[PDB]
Amino acid sequence: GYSDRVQQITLGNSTITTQEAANAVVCYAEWPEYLPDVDASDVNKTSKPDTSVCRFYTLDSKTWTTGSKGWCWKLPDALKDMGVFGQNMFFHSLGRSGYTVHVQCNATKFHSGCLLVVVIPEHQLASHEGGNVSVKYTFTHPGERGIDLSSAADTIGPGRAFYTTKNNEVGGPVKDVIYNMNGTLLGNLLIFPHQFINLRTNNTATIVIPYINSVPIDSMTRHNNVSLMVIPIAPLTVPTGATPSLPITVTIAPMCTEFSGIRSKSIVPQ
Amino acid sequence: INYYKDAASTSSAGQSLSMDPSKFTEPVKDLMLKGAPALN
Amino acid sequence: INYYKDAASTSSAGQSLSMDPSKFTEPVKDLMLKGAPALN
Amino acid sequence: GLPTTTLPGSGQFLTTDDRQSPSALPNYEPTPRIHIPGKVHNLLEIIQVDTLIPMNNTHTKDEVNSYLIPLNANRQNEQVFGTNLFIGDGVFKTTLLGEIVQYYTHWSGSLRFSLMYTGPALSSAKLILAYTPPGARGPQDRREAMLGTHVVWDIGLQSTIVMTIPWTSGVQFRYTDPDTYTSAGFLSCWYQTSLILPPETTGQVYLLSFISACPDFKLRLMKDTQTISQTVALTE
Amino acid sequence: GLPTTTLPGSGQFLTTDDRQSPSALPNYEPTPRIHIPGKVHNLLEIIQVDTLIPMNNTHTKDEVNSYLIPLNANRQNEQVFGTNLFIGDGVFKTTLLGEIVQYYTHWSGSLRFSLMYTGPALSSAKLILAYTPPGARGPQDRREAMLGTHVVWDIGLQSTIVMTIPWTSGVQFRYTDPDTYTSAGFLSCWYQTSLILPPETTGQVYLLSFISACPDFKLRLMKDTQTISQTVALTE
Amino acid sequence: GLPTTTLPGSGQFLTTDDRQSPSALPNYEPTPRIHIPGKVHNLLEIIQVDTLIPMNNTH
Amino acid sequence: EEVIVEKTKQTVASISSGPKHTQKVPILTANETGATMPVLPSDSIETRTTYMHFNGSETDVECFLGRAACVHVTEIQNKDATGIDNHREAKLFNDWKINLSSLVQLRKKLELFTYVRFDSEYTILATASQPDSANYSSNLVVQAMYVPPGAPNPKEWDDYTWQSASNPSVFFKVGDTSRFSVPYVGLASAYNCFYDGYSHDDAETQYGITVLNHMGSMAFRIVNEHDEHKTLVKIRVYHRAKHVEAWIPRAPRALPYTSIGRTNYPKNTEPVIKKRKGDIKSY
Amino acid sequence: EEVIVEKTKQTVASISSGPKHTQKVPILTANETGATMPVLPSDSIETRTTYMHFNGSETDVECFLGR
Amino acid sequence: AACVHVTEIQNKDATGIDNHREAKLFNDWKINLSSLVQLRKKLELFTYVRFDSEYTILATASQPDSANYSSNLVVQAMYVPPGAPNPKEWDDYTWQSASNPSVFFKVGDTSRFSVPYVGLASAYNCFYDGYSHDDAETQYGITVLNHMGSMAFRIVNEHDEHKTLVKIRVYHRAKHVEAWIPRAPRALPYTSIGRTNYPKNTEPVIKKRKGDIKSY
Amino acid sequence: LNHMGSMAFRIVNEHDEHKTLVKIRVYHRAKHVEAWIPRAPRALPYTSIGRTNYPKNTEPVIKKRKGDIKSY
Ligand SMILES: CCCCCCCCCCCCC/C=C/[C@@H](O)[C@@H](N)CO
């Protein structure tokens, strides 16, 4: 009867449906949960909005062409302007959350291509200028549009639409895909929670992320706990006559969200 | 046997013996059995 | 265990565990309860 | 002949080591203890006692005026005072709490901030004390301050208000060092209503501010303080 | 006065010794542990997770293409790829397994070699993966390879085949060092049938290869790796 | 602080001494023993086997 | 290849497995799920019974990060202090901003994980030399003082700061060695090897692990006054982790480092993956 | 913020305290008495439960003057 | 304990030198127990041997040239297993020894440590009637199995105004010994490590009688 | 009240052909401590042993603000 390909996820007033899934990854076999008293430090009663923030938010879609190199989003940064979650993020000095990420990309049984969907905890990026330069806030907190690696990649060496937000401007991150933007190799990214969207097999990837950090709760605007990466390993191959592109959509839903230290809105650069 | 007040002074802790790779090798939601079809 | 005749030779005494700030924070004659009006 | 092997560090002098040593005065009998009042066992006991904050540190030299927070009559929304919460610097550096905190590298816990009114008995006022956690800068107006942790104080028979600065932090400990990027946040006071002086009275009245630690306070890693120094050894 | 005799090696600093030492911070209380996901106890746990092999290392620079094994349509007996089994060198040197193996001098156990098809769902193929124990050189044709350990893989709904490289050795441990005379042997892939692409589809399809250790894997004698170096100490 | 007195010969290297020493390879697990024929425990065992004498050493 | 059997408390490496012809196919799977099925040799070939005779103790994180590694090499001098306006630039004393990222060997091992918690065992070795004219070599004593953040920094080699009334410090002979333990001293529950966050000083924006790495400094000095000659003293600091706990394994470093704290690599760097002499079919 | 609880011999740093509307006002006092009332955060804001996990051994006079 | 090796390192000006190993600023020893004949002959009385090792390293100094004084020096002995990076300079990055075990001790003093049985097989081979193939050269004998690492030695101190010669002597002692298959003892002198070769035109090993077979 | 004794130091050896300077550093560590009556910590620099005197024309010990009492 039931299969691992057909799944339904319901969070708040939103529901995700999939008929071509490949099971679902729960990071380190840990489901998200609220902060227990035994691990708490901050004495303030936390705020748990529940269904008003723990729901699915769909980001802007991306276009996967043969020249694509990859995309990168940072959480909770990617959701900073998303409904009540974003608002709570700016009014509180502290917060913690888990997530359920859902990456979508459908095609036909004539298409070829493979996407690596990986979640990297504490993904500290390298600077484009190299040596002893630090990445400026703007580039390290790109928002819902994320970072397009195709602006200056490693694999075939291209410069798609940009080089960065405007162009190669002081403080941008090194966009070499093969080096994971941090001096390690792409092939080893599999040590982190991941799934593949192999067009011949599945059309979605689902990863549930618990709160991962060395502190019980943390500043949400100054720290990005995880980084979501979508990278084309096997290039996109469309059938004869078809458009050489395919859309990719990302939908994220915060889970077990807690907020603390409420004051006025946060002052961030840009 | 006992000549140090702080625990940081002691030597190595020794082997854990509780090494389970599951959380890294099989962090999937639905139970995947070896031998059964990966995806029904 | 025991190789010194004088007590001055031994190491540190260790924590007291009986720390009560009362004699400094509330050295008042009449009992002052938190919640009750300071002066009636 | 017990076989031995001396380990690295043998013969070193670690000023922090706690070992036994031979007595230079064998058989000496120390004077008996008598009861002396005011015994202290832990420094965490004494920092719970509040001391005056030199909040009004706007003078060219140290003076009593440094402790007096001015309060002006008939002013509405204005700010009374403000300060960041670097307990190892600023207005806290010379207080008992600040002084003891400077002997340690890490701190944690809640602070007790008190305010005592010293104007005429026939005067009245309502103030709003605000604690602003880090992330957003210091409040520029009462509306901004009111959005964070605050207490509305009505001046009356009871002259003192005790606002608490709750431990609001992600990381469970903070650095005592003031040369750090961020502190506990900001503290500010605003006229909630206004100071109304009775007839035949004029001029400024003053507030006295106090600081102390709550029972949850923690202090770690002893270090030397930068509040004392010398260029030559002192002589008789 | 306990009589003693210091042994040879007294006062030496063996970087590998495990003894007790005095604490520089007496009475210090470390921050309490909180639950953090993903705890690792042994390196043998993490090498069981497979990572991509840069099998197609024929490029002038590092690229994603290094991981893509080309598969050509309508070819019969030909070879798809080949490689010796020096896990401390070649295509394995940069994989997670190869990297961890390089921190140790001896190895033993079985390897897990996986292959994932990424062509169209409407295509088909049958490949034969072969493991050739040492003694005879690498197979020059499918007939030669088929005589050793092998798996015939039929590409279908299940996209991945997991061939195992069984521990086949006389001596119970092998050197991790690639500058040795012999390794685990050879690995090769051949077209058992051929790749048939559906209509309206053309060009090459790709295979992704993975490597990991089986639960029987062993690693001994820690050593420094030759994958990292520096000429001057790094500064801020 | 245990009071001690080092004896003469302290710090010497007697090639014939039998004492313990720290292991340079902690936690190392040696290869398991398998049965090998012809184990020798004492040299007095092997001298009981006779060998040829070059009695005619006149060459 | 299961894990438990009665004889000698022996774990089996492989089980006896014969021919197969089933609908249960363990060697076929789907790697897109993100899982690595525990396929053993008995799943693809006929196997005999073998035992592990191995516990895997040398690969325990305690052992892996549990040996001393050089983390710093500094240099101090003993010479005439007269006329010098900067004792630190003259090397009469020197301070080390404590971190385990300066020397690459240990750095790479630590960076295999995201969070690590452990106690530290330090060993400091001091050696001397006299590059110029000397009639003899003098015995010297070195003082290593820990200056936590917030504590006054030494400005001169004979400052008042060297009294070390509250700062812990060690005194030992040059040629000799120093050793002490340090309990886990992080503000958080574990140290961070990486940090995807920044800080604000109203002046400059700092990004990375540098934001959290705010340990103190180690001030070194020769206690003795000057002799007729100049003496060069090199000080080597070694670190050994004890009672180790590690979290979130990572992809190992592939490219060379460029600076402390940053994950930057040099531009125009050599390829890290070996290029084949022949083609993809070569052995 | 009281001092004793059963689990692990743990001392509580702060107690769970909800909204209040009473005639018992702990935050008002008179400093002229020379006393410092032991006002905790649970007396002025809503708090959750937390544990000390701390004995205060490094601030003992033995340690303070003991180096 | 038996002496198994004597090596030599120097402390002198490193400027201008392009080969630190040839200048003796540091030196490495390909570990083996066949270089010095006394212990070699004892071990070779058996075919297979299994034991733990106890090493003692003695370092001594001397100054053959002009010197105003003698300096105290510290030596570092680092074990470089096969596969680990070899030191190219005396102050290389390899000397960090983050994973390689190493000992630091004073010249004039001694070093001591144990090593558990580290053979890949169940016992060490004293002899090996087999060979290996590298597609280039064919290697025969026990050399094929003797693939332990090397021991790198160096003076940690920088140079003084004079030159210092430091000799390093390594001693080996077997513990918890197990031996198999006794052999015919060595009769002829050795010529090289690992090989059972003897020199050609060698003197007779059996004593010739003064008289005849009937003499006493 | 401070009427402890003195500590006399000397080099036991006779003289050599050269002059030798020997510095002696004394360190103190309190054990089995008991303390009474906490005090206001020292704020001003010291001038002599035993006396609580401070120098005349001494610098202010409390930090002066860059702005006013309302500054952060
Ligand atoms: C007598 C002197 C006492 C000195 C005591 C203070 C030393 C502090 C030791 C802390 C060691 C640093 C811990 C941080 C480790 C991280 O750098 C790595 N996990 C990442 O590179």
Ligand SMILES: CCCCCCCCCCCCC/C=C/[C@@H](O)[C@@H](N)CO
């Ligand atoms: C701190 C440095 C640690 C160094 C540890 C590595 C040393 C390895 C010791 C192995 C000794 C060689 C064993 C082989 C013995 C054979 O040569 C004989 N049976 C035949 O000649």
